């Protein structure tokens, strides 16, 4: 019943994850109840054959930080039926982060969360640092944006 979920099509679809990013990538499969499930990670600059299914939903994140990534330039990837045996490519890339959110990523990577509020930075940035990327919060946002359309 959730808007973002795989459909149990049982129709096989061969797919190739291509990590065209400098991050270790965590593929995330939305199950038939919309719950995110992790799959084995992908080193930067590597590809992998996947046995997926038509109408399943995938998304991709940085494995260590859960920074959001894009797949074929969008948030979600849905396998289609293979045409003439050719697998479907999922080209995973960095998005264009805002400079602010790219700066937050670097600071998070260097500062333990217990130490954020020791930094001599403007106060509103403490909460920005604490509001780290989160798959379920992103799924709720994508759901709301979809309803709006």
């Amino acid at each position: 019943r959730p808007v973002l979920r795989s459909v149990n099509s049982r129709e096989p679809s061969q797919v190739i994850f291509c990590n065209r990013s400098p991050r270790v990538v965590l593929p995330v499969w939305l199950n038939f109840d919309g719950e995110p499930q992790p799959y084995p990670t992908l080193p930067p600059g590597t590809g992998r054959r996947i046995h997926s299914y038509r109408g399943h939903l995938w998304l991709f994140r940085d494995a260590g930080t859960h920074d959001g990534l894009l797949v074929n330039q969008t948030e979600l990837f849905v396998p289609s039926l293979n045409v003439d045996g050719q697998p479907i490519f999922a080209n995973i890339t960095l998005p264009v982060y805002t400079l602010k959110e790219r700066c937050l990523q670097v600071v998070r990577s260097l500062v333990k969360p217990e130490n954020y509020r020791r930094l001599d930075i403007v106060r509103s940035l403490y909460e920005d640092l604490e509001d780290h990327p989160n798959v379920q919060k992103d799924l709720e946002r994508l759901t709301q944006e979809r309803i709006a359309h």
């Binding site: 149990n8 049982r10 291509c18 990590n19 065209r20 499969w29 199950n31 038939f32 499930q37 799959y39 084995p40 992908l42 080193p43 600059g45 590597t46 590809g47 992998r48 054959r49 996947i50 046995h51 997926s52 299914y53 399943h56």
Partner: peptide, 16 residues
């Protein structure tokens, strides 16, 4: 019956 995605035991390949 629910069929989840799976990964064939196969080597990864390098992109260039």
């Amino acid at each position: 019956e629910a069929l989840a995605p799976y990964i064939p035991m196969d080597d990864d390949f390098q992109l260039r």
